[PDB]
Structure 1
Amino acid sequence: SHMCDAFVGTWKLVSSENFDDYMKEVGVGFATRKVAGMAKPNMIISVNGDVITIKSESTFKNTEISFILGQEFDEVTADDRKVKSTITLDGGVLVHVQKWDGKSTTIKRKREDDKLVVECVMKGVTSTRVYERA
């Protein structure tokens, strides 16, 4: 076992708050915000050795990232930002920091009860996205 075990599985979005506002803060344009905000993604998280894979799948975009904790990688986000990402585990929270164009956003994922809660922060704006097991 590893502590990241509680994240592994197939998850489906059950609620969202403030995601449009988060996307505005990140710089996402109108049409992408509308289509991305309508998406009902499934998140598939798996671990193989030291490599964690997170897939996001929806009618808007299918993405896949694989990474080792603490080891920077380059990522193309669903909204087509080219970012440099680093993901760490901080007291049981997966903390994903994305840097681009002198900007930064942080995505935190944690288990709470039977949920996987995703908190997306860009400056003072937070969106909370709740996933449950599929």
Structure 2
Amino acid sequence: CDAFVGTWKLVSSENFDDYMKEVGVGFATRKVAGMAKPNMIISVNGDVITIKSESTFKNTEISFILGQEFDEVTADDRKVKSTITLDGGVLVHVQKWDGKSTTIKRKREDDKLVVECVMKGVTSTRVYERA
């Protein structure tokens, strides 16, 4: 995951409000979370990958080993079971909760780190660049 390591700043977002609606996020959280321009800090130590999100809304952090399920409390306060794997260079992150599922894909494209969030038929694309 060397090409993911570093500090990344959100530069564009598309359809994030609609994605959050599909996930079930309520109005007030959607408004405040949607304003945020987070930094994403990715680091690797051995087999442990750490992804931190720093924002005015809610600072989060996950550490994980690829293929090994873990507990995650998301920024919108869902308690989910998560598994992250590498599929052909793309970090694929599946979250399970309350019988539902959403998938977050993270990949390097040119000088960007592109995050694609999918809930049923609704996708949001969030693009980051190096700080």
After TM superposition, the score normalised by the length of structure 1 is: 0.98
Deviation at 1:98, TM superposition (A): 0.1
Counterpart of 2:20 in 1: which secondary structure?
Answer: helix
Distance 1:108 1:39 in 2: 20
For structure 1, the 5+ residue unaligned runs are: none
User: How far 1:51 sits from its partner (Å)?
Assistant: 0.1
Indicate which of 119, 127, 133 corresponds to 2:124. 127
Counterpart CA distance in 1 for 2:107 and 2:51 is 14
Tell me whether 1:52 sits opposite 2:45 in the alignment.
no
- Give the Cα separation in 2 of the matches to 1:57 and 1:130: 15
Map Cα deviations across residues 64-93 of structure 1 (whole Å, 9 max, x no partner).
Answer: 000000000010000000000000000000
The residue correspondences of 1:16-55 to structure 2 (distance < 5 A) are: 16-55=13-52
Question: Shift of the alpha carbon at 1:104?
Answer: 0.2
When the two chains are superposed, the root-mean-square deviation of aligned CA atoms in Å is 0.2
1:17-70 CA-to-partner distances (Å, cap 9, x unmatched) read 000000000000000000000000000000000000000010000000000000
Deviation at 1:111, TM superposition (A): 0.2
Mapped partners of 1:80, 1:64: distance in 2: 13
What SS does the corresponding residue of 1:32 show, helix, strand or coil? helix
How big is the shift at 1:99?
A: 0.1
Moved over 3 A (4+): none
- Cα deviation digits, residues 104-123 of structure 1 (max 9, x gap): 00000000000000000000
What TM-score does the superposition give when structure 2 sets the normalisation length?
A: 1.00
Report sequence identity in percent. Answer: 100
Provide the aligned length of Structure 1 versus Structure 2.
131
Residue 36 of structure 2 is aligned to residue 62 of structure 1: no
Distance in 1 of aligned mates of 2:99 and 2:119: 13
Query: What is the CA-CA distance between 1:130 and the residue it aligns to?
Result: 0.1
